[PDB]
Amino acid sequence: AAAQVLSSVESEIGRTTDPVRMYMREMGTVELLTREGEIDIAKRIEDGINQVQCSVAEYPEAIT
DNA sequence: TAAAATGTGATCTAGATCACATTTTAGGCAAAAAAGGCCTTGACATCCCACCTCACGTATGCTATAATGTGTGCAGTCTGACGCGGCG
């Protein structure tokens, strides 16, 4: 529920031209996910990669 | 009338005469040969060119304890008029 902070704030942002406030306020939305979300991001990544390795394994001339 | 000009005439004195042989020497006409003008040759000297050429310099890659929302040193507020967007 951080996009709705951006919502009303931008509704009431005092004509703030500086992109620093913009970007820094935008990263405030996403939080710090840790300790296995790291490991789970890794798991999903290596899974999809090993399945593009299925995708090479399925192609015959890959060995050629 | 002072002072310069004018006759004595015999005894001389440096150059001209005068026909012909021999030099010379032009001057100017033909030219031999030498020294520029033309080219060549050998020998040198210095390269331009470029063709390479290794050392030093340079473009790029990872480093696994862990660490996770700026600010930050400034401005000193000039001011009167005119547009324009809210602001009722």
Verify if strand B has an atom below 7 Å from the CB of A1. Answer: no
Q: How far is the CA of A55 from the C1' of B47 (A)?
A: 69
**A15, A35, A36, A16: which is closest to A24 by C-alpha?**
A16
Show which positions of strand B are touched by protein (CB under 7 A): 68-71
- Give the resolution in Å: 3.9
CA distance A20 to A59: 49
Residue A25 approaches strand B within 7 Å at CB: yes
- The Cα A58–Cα A54 span in angstroms is 6
First to last CA, chain A: 53
